[PDB]
Write a protein that holds these residues in place. Structure first.
Motif, short mmCIF file in Angstrom:
data_model
loop_
_atom_site.label_atom_id
_atom_site.label_comp_id
_atom_site.label_asym_id
_atom_site.label_seq_id
_atom_site.Cartn_x
_atom_site.Cartn_y
_atom_site.Cartn_z
N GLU A 207 12.15 6.07 -3.67
CA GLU A 207 12.76 7.05 -2.47
C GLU A 207 12.07 8.69 -3.04
N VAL A 208 12.63 9.49 -3.76
CA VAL A 208 11.99 10.59 -4.28
C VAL A 208 10.84 10.88 -4.26
N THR A 209 9.94 10.17 -4.54
CA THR A 209 7.80 9.76 -4.77
C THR A 209 7.71 9.95 -3.33
N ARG A 210 8.16 9.42 -2.03
CA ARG A 210 7.97 8.97 -1.31
C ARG A 210 8.18 10.64 -0.07
N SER B 202 13.58 10.31 9.00
CA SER B 202 12.01 9.10 9.64
C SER B 202 13.25 8.62 10.22
N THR B 203 12.71 7.74 11.46
CA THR B 203 13.66 6.61 12.63
C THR B 203 14.01 5.43 11.75
N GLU B 204 14.38 4.88 12.43
CA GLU B 204 15.08 3.64 11.43
C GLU B 204 13.96 2.42 11.68
N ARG B 205 14.20 1.92 10.28
CA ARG B 205 13.05 0.60 10.14
C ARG B 205 13.47 0.38 8.85
N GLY B 206 13.13 -0.87 8.78
CA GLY B 206 13.76 -2.05 7.93
C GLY B 206 12.86 -2.08 6.71
N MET B 207 11.82 -3.40 6.65
CA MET B 207 11.35 -3.06 4.80
C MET B 207 10.82 -1.77 4.18
N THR B 208 10.39 -0.99 4.97
CA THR B 208 9.34 -0.07 4.14
C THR B 208 10.97 0.91 3.52
N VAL B 209 11.96 0.89 4.08
CA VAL B 209 12.89 1.36 2.62
C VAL B 209 13.49 0.49 2.07
N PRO B 210 13.73 0.85 0.37
CA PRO B 210 13.78 0.01 -0.73
C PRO B 210 15.54 -0.23 -0.97
N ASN C 234 0.61 -1.10 0.06
CA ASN C 234 -0.08 -0.04 -0.42
C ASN C 234 0.87 1.28 0.19
N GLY C 235 2.11 1.33 0.50
CA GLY C 235 3.11 2.32 0.29
C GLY C 235 3.17 1.89 -1.15
N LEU C 236 3.38 1.63 -1.94
CA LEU C 236 4.25 1.63 -2.74
C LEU C 236 2.69 2.35 -4.06
N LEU C 237 1.16 1.64 -3.50
CA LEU C 237 0.09 2.51 -3.91
C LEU C 237 -0.15 3.85 -3.48
N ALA C 238 0.59 4.53 -2.76
CA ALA C 238 -0.09 5.62 -2.46
C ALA C 238 2.03 6.11 -3.29
N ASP C 239 2.21 5.94 -3.69
CA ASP C 239 3.45 6.84 -4.55
C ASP C 239 2.81 6.80 -6.02
N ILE C 240 1.86 6.47 -6.27
CA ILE C 240 1.38 6.12 -7.91
C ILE C 240 0.27 6.55 -7.70
#
Ligand SMILES: Nc1ncnc2c1ncn2[C@@H]1O[C@H](COP(=O)(O)OP(=O)(O)OP(=O)(O)O)[C@@H](O)[C@H]1O
Ligand SMILES: Nc1ncnc2c1ncn2[C@@H]1O[C@H](COP(=O)(O)OP(=O)(O)O)[C@@H](O)[C@H]1O
Lengths: 240, 96, 673, 482, 223
Positions: D363-366, D238-246, C121-127
Motif C-alpha cells: 500500500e505504501v509503495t503504490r 481513490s474511489t471505491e474498488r475491490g480486487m486492486t486494494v490489498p 501488473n499493478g504488482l509489477l509496477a511497484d517493483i
C-alpha cells in the motif's frame, strides 16, 4: 588411454598416460600425467600405482597452480586450470589478500584492506560479464557458475567483514585455506581445526550455496571430526 | 441388477446373445392368436415388446428385509425404485 | 542422516547415541539460488535482480487469487532464466532490468485468469518503478500469416483475443517441452491448435498432430503390460505412438495430444519425459530417448487431481470464455443469422433482442425475490437456452421463407424467453416473474387473463394468438391398467410443445439436441416421456430406455450404448442404425459421487454428447475411437438439493432444463376411466 | 518396576558432572592456571544451560537433550588446541599465549549446536558464552557464583558450599519465573490423571441452547457483492474498488476461512444432538464430540485435521474459544458490513497476520512515492506510540502483550502481573538507506516456536542495562495470553 | 475393591503401568500378615484401612514417574470418595472442567467468574462476593487457602465432610496458580499427611524384594 611400450622380446605393455571424466556424450575433462602408470602381472599393483600417481600429479599441479594464480591474473588461470584447482586458487587468493589488508589495518589506519576488497569487487564484473553469458560445453559451463556462486558469497562476506585482525571471531568464522610452502602442503583451516587436502580428482561438480545454516553444519562437523565422532544430522524432508 | 429388473427388465446382452430371435420365434405362434392381427402376419420388434410385456406381467418379486441392522436404510436410499413401485404391506410389529 | 520417526522407524540404543553428534539443517533457500541462476545466465546486476525475483514471486504467490494451475516455483524460475540466457546473448547492451521485466511479465502473462491480470501488473509496477513500459517483441511473419488462413476458411472470424492467445501459445511452444491448454468447453482450444499447426506448416517445417484420451483406455493398456495368461509381452499404445514418432530422419514435427483431465495415477509416470531427463522408461526395461521432433500437449480443461510435481513440470496457457461470451455469443449468432436469412431478420430481431436481453436478464435473478432457483446456474446457460429455443420458434417461417413483422417477433421473443428462464421456478415465482413482465415487458396475453399465468398460453404460428388446450382421447377397449396407459393431460401437451421445438433443430452450433425435465419423485416424468415416445414412428425413429442406480459404471454405460448402436456408424456403417435413435434416462443424479466431490459417472455421457464416440476396451487396439454420427438424448432430474445429488456443472451447458410441476388437476385425470 | 529418573538441582547436576570424568582429566594438566579454569568454565556452562529448561518456554522453546557427549567432546578439542599451541612454545610468558576466540565459535555453534532447531536459541546461546567466558581468563574476579583454587578436594568443598535452592537471577532471569514453572508442572501433572480416566443428559441440551447463539453464515453471493461495493486505502486518494486494494482481498480471504469454520461447527453441533434427540446410526466422532462437550477441551474436529489446520485452539469449550471466534466475526462484520476502515486493528483475530503487514508494505509503495519507490527497496520499522490518549502511513495495532518490563523506561516487573499490556506500536516503512537498539520477537501463541514469528520489533530503551541483559532475560511481545 | 479399581485405570494413561490382580492379592494377603492382628479386632479393622492403603500405595509409586506422582494419589482419593461420600461425577467434572457483575477483577479473572457462575456457586457471586471489603487483600496474598480462609461460607468450611471439596472447587476456579499445593493439602487431609512425604528407594533394601525368580525392570529417563 593405453599406450603400448614395446619392451625388447616382450609383448608391448600398455601404460596409462592420461585420465578423463566424461559427462554427456562429448563433454569431458582431460588430465595429463607426467608420472605414468604401467600395466603389470598383478592387478592390485597397477591399480595402486594409478591411485598413487594420480595423487602425486594432482599435488604437483596444485603446487604450480598456487604460484600461477597470482602471477598471471584472474582470466588466464581460470581458463587454463581445472575447476577444482581454480576454486582452490580463488579461495587461497581471497584468504591471503584479506590477511594482508587486515595486517595493514593493524599497522595504522590504511586503505589497503578496502583496496583489496575493491579488487574482489572488480573481479566480480570481469567474471560475470563474459564467461557466463556465452560459452562452449557443459563442463566448461558448470565450472563457471560453480566459481560465481563462491565469488558472490565471497563478496557478501567481504563487504561486512568488520574484523580488526586475524585473531578476530568474524575472520576465524569461515572455511579458510593455506597452501604452506616451507613445508609444501595444503591445509584447510576452520577456526583452529585443520586438515590436509586429500587430492581426489573430481572434475567439475555442482557444489551448492552457503547459507548460515550450512555454516553452522560446517562448524559442527569440523568439531565432530576434531573429537573423533560422527555427525548424525536430523530433521524433516529435504533440507540439505 | 434386481433394480434394473424392476424398472426395465431387459438385461443388457443377456437375452440378446444370439438367442432373442430364436426365443421370439418360439413365441410368434402364440402371438398370432394373442394379438390377432387378422391372423395374417406380424413384425419383429413388436414380438420383443410383447415378450417384455409377458415377462413383466408374470414376474412377481417378493423382497423380505430386516428392519434392524445398518444396511437396510442406506440400501433403500441407494435404490429409489426399491421402496417406490414395490407396495409396502407392512407386517405388524408383533402387537399384543 | 538418521531421520526422526515414521511408520517403520525405530530407535537407536543408548549405546549408539553416545557416539554421534547432532547436525541441524532446517530451512532451505530461494534467494542465493536466484542469484546463482542469474549468474549461470551471465548477468551483472545479480544481487539486486535476485531480490527483485524473490519479492515479486513471493508476493505473486501469497496475495494473488488461488487457482490450482498456478505455479511460481523453482521450475518456473529456471525456465525464465534459460529464456533470459539468449536475450542477453544477443548484441543487446541495454540495462538488464528492462530485459528482466519484459521476460518475467511476458512469461507469466499466459497462465493467469482474466481477474489476476490487473493485480499482476499493478504488482509489477511497484517493483519496477523507474521503468514505465516496454513493447512486447512481436513476430511479424506470424502476425501477418494468421489472418490469411483465418479468411481462407469459411466459418472463421478473426479476433484480437484469438491473436493474443495463439501468440502466447506460440511462445510457450518455443520455450518448453510440453504444454497444457487449460480452459472451459466450447472455447476453441482445438481450433487454436489446428490453426497454429497450419501457420507452422505454411512456411515449410511441417507439423502433425495425434489425438488420445487417457481415461477412456486402461493405463495397463496405455503403457503395455506382461500378459497374465501366456507370460509374454503386449505393446502399449502410447509407447507405440512414441516409438513411431521419435524416429530420426523424418520431416514431421509430431504433437501427441492427451485430451481429458489429469488423474495422477496415469500421468505421474511421465515425470521423466516432462523433466530435464527427456527419457521414457518402461516396466519392460525399455528406455527410449526424446528428440526435438516431438512435443506433448494436453487439451485438458482444468487440473483438479494434480500435484505440483506435474503442475510445474510443463507449460500452460489459459483460454477464457470471453473469447465468445454472453452478448458476444449473441452477436455471433446474429452473424450466422445474416448469412442466409439476411433479408432483414438479424436487424429486426435484434432491435428488440438487444435491450430486451441486456437490461432485463439481471433484474430477474434477485431483483424480485426469485429465492428458489432449484438449479443454481450461471447466466450463459439461460442465454444459450433462449437462443436455441428461439431458433426452433422461428424455424417454421424459415422453412416456408416468409418474412414477418416486428410485433410477431417481439411476441415470439416473449414466449420463448418466458420458458428457459421460468422453467426453474415454482408457481409463486412464476406469478412474480409474471408481474415483472407485466410491469416492464412487451405484451403477453391480455384477452381474458382470468387468474392465469403467461406460461399457460403459447404463441400460435398461424396467427398472433395465445391459446392452449388438450385434445380428447379416452382409451382402447382393453381393461388392463397398462391398457389404460395415460390420458391427454395439459401438462403432457405443454411438455410436448416445449420439447419438440428443440428436438427438431438440426444440430446447430451451441446446440446438442438434448432435453432435461426436473420433477419430484412421482411427478409424471416417465408418464409424459412415454406419452411422447409412443408417438414415435419406428420406420425412421427408434427409442431406447435406460435407468440409473448408484453403482453403474463406464463398462455398463459403454456396453449399453454399444449394444444400442450395434455398429461403428463412423466408418460408413449401420443401415439399421441409419434411422434416428434416442436414449432416455430417468435420473442422472443417482450414480455414486466420489469422495472428492467429482462423480466419475457422467463423464462418459459428457464426452458422448460433446464430441460423440469414445475409446474402445476390447484387449485388441487402444488408440482409436468409435464415433456416433447420430444420436439423441433426453433425461429427467429429481429436484436436486439436500439429500438429492446434483450433476456436474460442466454438463449443464448442453441439456435444455426445465421444471415439471404437480398437475393440480387430479380430479380430471381419473374421470374418464 | 523401578524408576530412577534424574532431579532438577544445580549442585546435584554439577556434583554428578564432577563424578563422571574426574581424577584423570583433572589431574593430567601440565598447567594449573589456564586450562584448569577452562574446564571449570565449560562444566559450569554445561550445568547452567541444562538447568535453564526448568522454567519452560521462557528458557527454551522446546526441550533439548544436552549430555556429556558434547561436554567430553568440547574437551578433546581444546586439549588438541592447547597441546599444538604449546608444542611450539619454548617459554610461557604467563602460563599461555592463547587467543581464545575460536573456542567461542566452537562451543557456541557446534557441540550444543547440533540439538538447536530454533533460530533464537542460536544468539541466546552465544550470549551465554559471552557473559560466562568473558572473552578472557581474568585470574582475579568474582563470578557474577564463586571462583576456584587449584585442588581436587577443594572442588568438592567448593561444590559443598553451593546452596541447595538458588534464585533465577543466577541465570540472569527474573525472580517471577517461579510462578510459571509451578503452573506448567501443575498443568502437565493434572493432564496425566486426566488420562487415567478419559453423559447423554442435559449437557447435550446445553449445547443445544448454544448452537442458536453463534452468528449466522455469510453467503458468498452477498459477500462478493459487499467487498466489491466499497474499498480503498483512503477515501480521498481513490474511489471505491475491490480486487486492486490489498486490504479488500484480505477481507475476502478472512471471511472465507471464517465461513469455513462457522459451517463446520454449526453442522457438527446439529449432528451431535440429532443422534439421540434425532435419529442416526451412532458415529465414533460424534461420541468423541459428546465427551469433549462435557469436558473443558473442545473436540479435535475444530482444531486439527490429518496434516494440520489450527484455527483458534484455546483451552475452554465456550469460555474463550467461542468467545474468540465470536469476537473475530464481530470485528470482521463491522470491518465488512459498514465497510469502513476502523482504527485500532486487532491483530489476534486475523488468521494470517503476515499478509496484513506485506499488504501495508504494498500500500505504501503504490500510494506514496509512486515511480520513486520499489517494493524491494522498502524496509520495515516501528515507532511505539508512548502515550495513553490520542490516517498516516502505518497501522494501529491493539491487544499486544509484553512480558517482564514496561513500555518505555523498561524496569523490573513486580511479583504479580507477569503479562502486561503493550501500547500502540504504529508501524513505519521507508526505503533502504533513505548497536544500542534491542530487537524483540512477536509470537502469536505463548508456545514460542520458530513458527508464529510474525515480525521483529526494534525496542531501543536501554538506559544503563545493555540489550544483552534483556536478551538473557528473554523478553518478548506475544499476542495471546494463555 | 474401590482401591483396586483405581490402579486399573493407570494402565490406560500409559503402557508399562500394568500389573495383575495376583500381585495385588499377594500384597493384600501380606498386609494382613504384617501388622493386622494384635488385639481388639475392631481397632485392627481400622488398622486395615490405615495400613492396607499405604502398602499398595508405595508399591505403585516405585514404578511411577515424577509427573505421575501426584496423579495416582488424586484418583485414589476420588475413587475412595465415589462410594462412601457419594461425590457426584458431575461435581467431579465441575472440579476438572468449567463478566457483567464484577468490574475490578481482570478479564482473565472475569472468565473465571463466568466459569464458576454457570449448589451455592450460582448463589454467591452477588454483593456477598462483590463486597470488595477484605477479599482484595486475600486475592493479593500468596497462599490464599491457608491463613486468610474465605469466610464466604464459614460453616460450610467447618463441617469438612464436603467442605474440603467445596474449598478446592473455589481455589481452582479463582486461583489456578495455587491448585497444586492445595492438591497436596486435601490429599493430606482426606487420606493422611503420610502420603504427602518424600520417598527414596534404598537399592540395598530393594534387593531384598528381588528373589531369584523375578527380574528388576527399569523405566529410565534421559540423563
Ligand atoms: N471416459 C468416461 N466417459 C464417461 N463416463 C466415465 C468415463 N470414465 C469413467 N466414467 C464413469 O465412471 C463410472 C465408474 O466409476 P469408477 O469405477 O471409476 O469409480 P472408482 O473411482 O473406481 O470408485 P470405485 O472403485 O469405488 O467404484 C462408469 O460407470 C462411468 O459412468
Ligand atoms: N537434517 C536434515 N537435512 C535434510 N534432509 C533431512 C534431514 N533430516 C531428514 N531429512 C530428509 O527426510 C527424508 C526421510 O526422513 P523420514 O523423515 O525418513 O524420517 P522417518 O523415517 O523417521 O519418518 C529424507 O529425504 C531426508 O532428506
Amino acid at each position: 588411454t593405453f599406450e603400448s611400450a614395446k619392451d625388447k622380446k616382450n609383448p608391448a605393455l600398455k601404460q596409462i598416460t592420461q585420465i578423463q571424466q566424461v559427462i554427456g556424450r562429448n563433454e569431458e575433462n582431460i588430465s595429463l600425467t607426467g608420472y605414468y602408470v604401467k600395466c603389470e602381472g598383478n592387478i592390485e599393483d597397477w591399480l595402486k600405482k594409478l591411485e598413487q600417481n594420480m595423487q602425486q600429479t594432482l599435488k604437483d599441479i596444485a603446487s604450480a597452480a598456487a604460484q600461477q594464480v597470482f602471477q598471471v591474473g584472474l582470466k588466464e588461470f581460470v581458463s587454463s586450470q581445472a575447476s577444482q584447482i581454480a576454486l582452490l586458487g580463488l579461495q587461497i587468493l581471497w584468504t591471503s589478500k584479506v590477511n594482508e589488508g587486515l595486517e595493514r589495518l593493524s599497522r595504522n589506519e590504511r586503505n589497503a584492506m578496502d583496496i583489496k576488497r575493491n579488487e574482489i569487487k572488480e573481479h566480480m564484473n570481469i567474471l560475470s560479464s563474459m564467461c557466463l553469458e556465452d560459452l562452449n560445453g557443459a563442463v566448461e559451463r558448470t565450472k563457471v557458475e560453480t566459481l560465481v556462486t563462491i565469488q558472490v558469497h565471497q563478496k557478501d562476506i567481504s563487504m561486512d567483514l568488520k574484523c580488526k585482525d586475524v585473531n578476530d571471531f568474524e575472520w576465524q568464522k569461515q572455511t579458510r585455506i593455506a597452501w604452506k610452502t616451507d613445508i609444501d602442503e595444503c591445509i584447510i583451516s576452520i577456526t583452529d581445526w585443520d586438515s590436509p587436502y586429500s587430492y581426489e580428482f573430481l572434475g567439475a561438480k555442482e557444489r551448492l550455496c552457503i547459507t548460515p545454516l550450512t555454516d553452522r553444519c560446517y562448524i559442527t562437523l569440523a568439531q565432530a571430526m576434531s573429537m573423533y565422532y560422527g555427525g548424525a544430522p536430523a530433521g524433516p524432508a529435504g533440507t540439505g | 441388477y434386481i433394480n434394473m429388473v424392476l424398472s426395465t427388465g431387459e438385461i443388457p446382452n443377456l437375452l440378446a446373445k444370439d438367442e432373442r430371435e430364436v426365443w421370439l420365434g418360439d413365441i410368434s405362434q402364440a402371438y398370432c392368436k394373442e394379438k390377432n392381427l387378422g391372423n395374417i402376419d406380424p413384425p419383429q420388434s413388436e414380438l420383443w415388446t410383447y415378450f417384455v410385456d409377458r415377462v413383466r406381467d408374470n414376474f412377481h418379486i417378493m423382497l423380505c428385509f430386516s428392519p434392524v441392522g445398518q444396511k437396510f436404510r442406506e440400501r433403500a436410499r441407494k435404490f429409489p425404485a426399491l421402496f417406490n413401485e414395490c407396495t409396502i404391506d407392512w407386517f405388524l410389529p408383533w402387537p399384543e | 542422516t538418521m531421520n526422526p520417526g515414521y511408520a517403520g522407524r525405530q530407535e537407536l540404543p543408548e549405546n549408539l547415541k553416545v557416539l554421534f553428534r547432532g547436525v541441524s539443517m532446517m530451512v532451505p533457500d530461494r534467494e542465493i539460488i536466484i542469484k546463482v541462476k542469474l549468474a549461470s545466465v551471465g548477468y551483472l546486476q545479480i544481487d539486486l535482480l535476485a531480490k527483485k525475483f524473490n519479492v515479486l514471486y513471493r508476493l505473486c504467490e501469497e496475495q494473488l487469487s488461488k487457482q490450482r494451475h498456478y505455479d511460481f516455483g523453482l521450475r518456473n524460475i529456471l525456465s525464465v532464466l534459460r529464456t533470459a540466457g539468449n536475450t542477453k546473448r544477443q548484441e543487446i547492451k541495454s540495462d538488464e532490468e528492462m530485459l528482466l521485466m519484459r521476460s518475467l511479465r511476458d512469461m507469466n502473462l499466459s497462465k493467469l485468469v482474466a481477474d489476476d491480470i490487473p493485480l499482476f501488473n499493478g504488482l509489477l509496477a511497484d517493483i519496477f518503478p523507474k521503468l514505465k513500459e516496454v513493447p512486447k517483441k512481436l513476430y511479424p511473419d506470424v502476425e501477418k500469416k494468421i489472418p490469411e488462413e483465418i479468411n481462407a476458411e469459411s466459418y472463421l472470424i478473426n479476433t484480437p483475443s484469438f491473436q493474443l492467445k495463439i501468440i502466447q501459445l506460440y511462445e510457450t511452444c518455443l520455450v518448453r517441452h510440453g504444454f497444457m491448454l487449460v480452459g472451459p468447453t466450447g472455447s476453441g482450444k482445438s481450433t487454436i491448435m489446428k490453426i497454429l499447426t497450419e501457420v507452422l506448416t505454411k512456411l515449410g517445417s511441417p507439423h502433425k498432430i495425434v489425438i488420445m484420451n487417457p481415461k477412456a483406455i486402461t493405463a495397463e493398456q496405455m503403457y503395455g503390460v506382461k500378459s497374465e495368461i501366456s507370460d509374454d509381452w503386449i505393446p502399449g499404445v502410447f509407447s507405440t505412438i512414441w516409438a513411431k514418432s521419435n524416429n530420426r530422419a523424418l520431416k514431421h514435427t509430431t504433437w501427441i495430444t492427451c485430451d481429458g483431465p489429469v488423474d495422477a495415477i496415469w500421468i505421474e509416470n511421465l515425470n521423466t519425459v516432462l523433466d530435464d531427463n527427456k527419457i521414457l522408461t518402461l516396466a519392460n526395461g525399455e528406455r527410449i530417448a526424446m528428440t526435438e521432433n516431438c512435443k506433448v500437449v494436453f487439451e485438458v480443461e482444468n487440473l483438479n487431481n494434480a500435484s505440483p510435481a506435474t503442475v510445474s513440470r510443463c507449460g500452460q496457457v489459459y483460454v477464457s470464455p470471453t473469447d465468445l461470451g454472453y452478448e458476444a455469443v449473441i452477436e455471433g449468432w446474429i452473424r450466422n443469422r445474416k448469412a442466409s436469412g439476411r433479408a432483414e431478420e438479424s436487424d429486426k430481431l435484434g432491435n428488440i433482442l438487444r435491450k430486451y436481453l441486456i437490461n432485463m436478464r439481471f433484474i430477474e435473478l434477485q431483483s424480485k425475490e426469485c429465492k428458489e432457483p432449484m438449479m443454481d446456474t450461471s447466466p450463459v446457460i439461460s442465454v444459450i437456452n433462449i437462443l436455441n429455443l428461439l431458433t426452433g420458434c422461428l424455424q417454421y417461417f424459415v422453412q416456408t421463407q416468409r418474412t414477418l413483422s416486428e410485433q410477431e417477433y417481439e411476441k415470439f421473443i416473449v414466449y420463448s424467453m418466458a420458458w428457459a428462464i421460468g422453467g426453474i421456478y415454482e408457481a409463486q415465482d412464476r406469478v412474480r416473474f409474471h408481474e415483472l413482465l407485466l410491469a416492464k415487458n412487451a405484451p403477453i396475453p391480455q384477452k381474458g387473463k382470468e387468474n392465469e399465468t403467461v406460461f399457460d398460453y403459447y404463441v400460435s404460428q398461424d396467427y398472433l394468438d395465445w391459446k392452449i388446450c388438450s385434445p380428447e382421447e379416452w382409451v382402447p377397449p382393453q381393461s388392463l391398467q397398462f391398457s389404460q396407459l395415460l390420458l391427454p393431460t395439459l401438462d403432457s401437451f405443454r411438455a410436448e410443445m416445449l420439447l419438440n421445438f428443440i428436438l427438431t433443430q438440426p444440430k446447430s452450433h451451441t446446440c446438442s439436441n438434448s432435453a432435461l425435465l426436473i420433477g419430484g419423485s412421482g411427478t409424471a416424468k416417465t408418464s409424459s416421456v412415454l406419452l411422447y415416445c409412443n408417438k414415435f414412428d419406428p420406420q425412421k425413429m427408434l427409442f431406447k430406455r435406460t435407468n440409473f442406480s448408484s453403482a453403474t459404471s463406464p463398462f455398463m454405460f459403454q456396453s449399453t450404448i454399444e449394444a444400442e448402436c450395434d455398429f461403428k456408424v463412423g466408418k460408413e456403417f449401420a443401415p439399421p442404425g441409419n434411422k434416428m435413435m434416442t436414449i432416455f434416462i430417468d435420473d442422472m443424479s443417482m450414480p455414486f459421487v466420489n469422495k472428492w466431490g467429482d462423480q466419475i459417472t457422467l463423464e462418459l455421457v459428457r464426452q458422448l454428447i460433446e464430441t460423440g464416440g469414445f475409446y474402445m476396451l476390447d484387449k485388441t487396439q487402444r488408440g482409436n475411437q468409435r464415433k456416433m454420427k447420430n444420436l439423441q438424448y433426453i433425461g429427467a432430474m429429481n429436484h436436486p438439493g439436500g439429500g438429492r445429488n446434483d450433476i456436474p456443472n460442466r454438463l449443464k451447458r448442453q441439456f435444455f432444463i426445465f421444471n415439471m410441476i404437480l398437475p393440480l388437476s387430479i380430479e380430471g385425470i381419473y374421470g374418464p376411466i | 518396576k523401578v524408576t530412577n529418573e534424574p532431579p532438577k538441582g544445580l549442585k546435584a547436576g554439577l556434583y554428578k558432572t564432577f563424578t563422571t570424568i574426574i581424577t584423570q582429566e583433572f589431574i593430567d594438566k601440565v598447567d594449573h592456571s589456564n586450562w584448569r579454569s577452562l574446564i571449570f568454565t565449560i562444566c559450569f556452562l554445561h550445568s547452567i544451560v541444562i538447568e535453564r529448561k526448568k522454567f519452560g518456554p521462557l528458557g527454551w522453546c522446546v526441550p533439548y537433550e544436552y549430555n556429556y557427549s558434547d561436554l567430553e567432546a568440547s574437551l578433546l578439542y581444546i586439549e588438541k588446541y592447547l597441546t599444538n599451541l604449546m608444542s611450539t612454545p619454548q617459554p610461557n610468558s604467563h602460563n599461555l599465549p592463547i587467543s581464545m576466540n575460536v573456542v567461542r565459535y566452537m562451543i557456541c555453534e557446534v557441540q550444543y549446536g547440533g540439538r538447536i532447531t530454533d533460530d533464537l536459541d542460536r544468539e541466546l546461546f552465544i550470549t551465554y558464552g559471552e557473559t560466562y567466558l568473558k572473552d578472557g581468563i581474568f585470574g582475579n574476579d568474582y563470578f557474577f557464583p564463586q571462583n576456584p583454587s587449584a585442588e581436587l578436594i577443594k572442588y568438592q568443598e567448593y561444590i559443598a558450599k553451593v546452596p541447595t535452592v538458588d534464585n533465577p537471577e543466577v541465570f540472569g532471569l527474573h525472580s517471577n519465573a517461579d510462578l510459571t514453572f509451578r503452573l506448567k508442572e501443575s498443568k502437565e501433572m493434572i493432564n496425566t490423571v486426566m488420562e487415567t480416566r478419559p453423559r447423554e443428559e442435559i449437557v447435550q441440551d446445553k449445547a443445544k441452547d448454544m448452537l442458536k447463539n453463534l452468528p449466522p453464515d455469510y453467503n458468498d453471493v452477498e459477500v462478493r457483492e459487499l467487498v466489491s461495493k466499497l474499498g480503498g486505502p483512503n477515501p480521498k486518494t481513490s474511489t471505491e474498488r475491490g480486487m486492486t486494494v490489498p486490504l479488500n482481498i484480505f477481507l475476502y480471504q478472512e471471511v472465507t476461512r471464517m465461513q469455513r469454520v462457522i459451517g463446520l461447527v454449526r453442522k457438527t453441533l446439529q449432528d451431535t444432538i440429532l443422534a439421540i434427540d434425532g435419529q442416526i446410526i451412532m458415529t465414533p466422532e460424534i461420541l468423541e464430540a459428546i465427551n469433549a462437550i462435557y469436558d473443558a477441551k473442545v473436540p479435535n474436529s475444530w482444531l486439527y485435521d490429518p496434516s494440520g489446520a489450527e484455527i483458534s485452539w484455546l483451552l475452554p469449550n465456550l469460555g474463550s474459544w467461542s468467545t474468540s471466534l465470536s469476537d473475530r466475526n464481530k470485528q470482521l462484520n463491522d470491518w465488512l458490513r459498514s465497510g469502513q476502515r476502523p482504527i485500532l486493528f486487532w491483530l489476534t483475530g486475523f488468521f494470517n497476520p503476515q499478509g496484513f503487514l506485506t499488504g501495508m508494505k504494498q500500500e505504501v509503495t503504490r500510494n506514496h512515492k509512486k515511480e520513486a519507490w520499489s517494493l524491494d527497496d522498502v524496509v520495515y520499522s516501528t515507532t511505539v506510540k508512548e502515550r495513553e490518549k490520542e490516517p498516516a502511513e502505518g497501522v494501529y495495532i491493539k491487544g499486544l502483550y509484553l512480558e517482564g518490563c514496561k513500555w518505555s523506561k523498561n524496569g523490573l516487573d513486580d511479583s504479580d502481573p507477569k503479562k502486561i499490556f503493550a501500547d500502540l506500536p504504529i508501524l513505519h516503512v521507508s526505503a533502504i538507506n533513505k548497536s544500542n537498539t534491542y530487537l524483540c520477537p512477536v509470537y502469536k501463541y505463548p508456545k514460542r516456536t520458530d513458527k508464529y514469528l510474525i515480525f521483529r520489533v526494534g525496542l531501543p530503551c536501554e538506559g544503563s542495562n545493555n540489550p544483552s541483559h534483556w536478551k538473557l532475560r528473554g523478553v518478548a511481545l506475544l499476542c495471546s495470553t494463555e | 475393591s474401590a482401591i483396586y479399581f483405581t490402579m486399573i485405570e493407570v494402565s490406560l494413561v500409559n503402557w508399562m503401568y500394568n500389573s495383575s490382580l495376583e500381585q495385588f492379592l499377594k500384597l493384600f494377603i501380606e498386609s494382613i500378615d504384617l501388622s493386622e492382628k494384635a488385639q481388639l479386632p475392631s481397632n485392627r479393622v481400622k488398622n486395615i484401612i490405615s495400613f492396607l492403603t499405604f502398602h499398595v500405595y508405595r508399591y505403585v509409586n516405585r514404578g511411577l514417574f515424577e509427573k505421575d506422582k501426584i496423579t495416582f494419589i488424586l484418583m485414589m482419593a476420588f475413587k475412595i470418595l465415589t462410594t462412601a461420600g457419594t461425590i457426584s461425577s458431575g461435581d467431579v467434572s465441575l472440579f476438572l472442567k468449567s463478566q457483567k457483575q464484577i468490574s475490578y477483577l481482570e478479564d482473565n479473572q472475569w472468565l473465571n467468574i463466568l466459569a464458576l457462575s454457570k449448589p451455592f456457586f450460582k448463589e454467591l457471586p452477588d454483593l456477598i462476593s462483590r463486597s470488595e471489603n477484605q477479599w482484595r487483600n486475600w486475592i493479593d496474598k500468596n497462599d490464599p487457602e491457608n491463613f486468610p480462609i474465605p469466610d464466604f461460607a464459614e460453616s460450610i468450611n467447618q463441617e469438612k465432610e464436603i467442605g474440603s471439596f467445596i474449598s478446592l472447587c473455589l481455589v481452582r476456579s479463582l486461583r489456578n496458580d495455587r491448585t497444586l499445593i492445595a492438591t497436596q493439602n486435601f490429599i493430606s487431609n482426606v487420606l493422611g499427611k503420610e502420603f504427602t512425604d518424600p520417598i527414596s528407594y534404598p537399592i540395598e533394601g530393594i534387593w531384598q524384594e528381588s528373589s531369584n525368580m523375578d527380574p528388576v525392570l527399569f523405566l529410565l529417563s534421559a540423563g
